[PDB]
Design a binder for this molecule. Sequence first.
Ligand SMILES: CC(=O)N1c2ccc(-c3cc[nH]n3)cc2[C@H](Nc2ccc(C#N)cc2)C[C@@H]1C
Ligand SMILES: CC(=O)N1c2ccc(-c3cc[nH]n3)cc2[C@H](Nc2ccc(C#N)cc2)C[C@@H]1C
Lengths: 115, 107
Amino acid sequence: GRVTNQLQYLHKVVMKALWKHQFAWPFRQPVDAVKLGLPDYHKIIKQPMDMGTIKRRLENNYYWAASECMQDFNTMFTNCYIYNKPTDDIVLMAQTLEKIFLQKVASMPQEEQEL
Amino acid sequence: TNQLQYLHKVVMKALWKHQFAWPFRQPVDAVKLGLPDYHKIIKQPMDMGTIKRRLENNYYWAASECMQDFNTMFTNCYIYNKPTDDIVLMAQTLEKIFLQKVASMPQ
Ligand SMILES: CC(=O)N1c2ccc(-c3cc[nH]n3)cc2[C@H](Nc2ccc(C#N)cc2)C[C@@H]1C
Ligand SMILES: CC(=O)N1c2ccc(-c3cc[nH]n3)cc2[C@H](Nc2ccc(C#N)cc2)C[C@@H]1C
């Protein structure tokens, strides 16, 4: 991992906006299949992801490039759409957060430079 | 804008020619596919051909609006299909390319 302009932006602009959002609470920690009573969750979702894990990775300089962090956000949202029923409210919550994610990504610095 | 030209000439071009892109280049035809519930579940259909036409006709006012349409296309696929369907893996592969190319879009 390393520090880059784009990773700084993802941490301080993108994660900042998503973490505090009123729909963020289901995504701040890994899906807990015991707490939720979902014994098939890990049979369907093979790469769990959540914002707490992404945030710790940003804090610990785990990522080498901003695209790696973007892929983790994407996996978090895609797992939600794959696992849940189409009409579940969690899908709407993920959609709302993901639209913010994309809006902020559209304004990320263009060329990635190590700091 | 420079961003929209990049989404058209770089991002869409890379996705469109990919070996997994054929299901996504035109709207889902629910009648031909025998999927009578498709439009009961998916209320905002989206596909690459629609996005490309919008790019060509200067429909979009901002890059994020175009990105939202790509996202809707992929999300619809994940919401409608079974988790184990090959189409879901095809969408995941294309979406990863989409994000990789978006990371280099000019600001
Ligand atoms: C992110 C994701 O896909 N999921 C996820 C993850 C964490 C949490 C959670 C965290 C603390 N508590 N619950 C709840 C859920 C979803 N389930 C519900 C969501 C909202 C409401 C209401 N209102 C009721 C159920 C199930 C689903 C597998
Ligand atoms: C994008 C999307 O979600 N969908 C979508 C759209 C267009 C098309 C299509 C286009 C030409 N022909 N078929 C096929 C499909 C999927 N169905 C299949 C995909 C691959 C294979 C194999 N091998 C068999 C079925 C169903 C699903 C509703």
